[PDB]
Amino acid sequence: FASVYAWNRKRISNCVADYSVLYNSASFSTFKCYGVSPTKLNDLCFTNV
Amino acid sequence: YADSFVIRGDEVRQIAPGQTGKIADYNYKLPDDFTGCVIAWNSNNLDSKV
């Protein structure tokens, strides 16, 4: 991974994102969503992630 | 009503109203206007074996 004082920054771009494989992986100890509740991610489209 | 079960330690956060996860999605779902209380305690010595 990358340090905390120089974090990394990847600019995901035009693709097919499946936040369900994330959302249900049960391997994550913390999964908070703020602007938008998690289950509605696989039904929206943005400009950049 | 009293419902009883056993889960991992860090899955106790999905046992409430308006939650999501492998547990709350399809194992045990709490309505969004729940009324009762949720109680949980560690049981490592009883349920885990060598």
Place this chain on the structure above:
Amino acid sequence: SSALGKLQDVVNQNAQALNTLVKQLSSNFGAISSVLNDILSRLDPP
């Protein structure tokens, strides 16, 4: 043919109020957007 301001004013007042009513359908009042199809698309029901 070349004065009806009292009749023009009551027309103008009513139109100015009806426009202010519709122009309020695009304020947040302290929400994330002004569209219900945008709060029902990036938020869970709770």
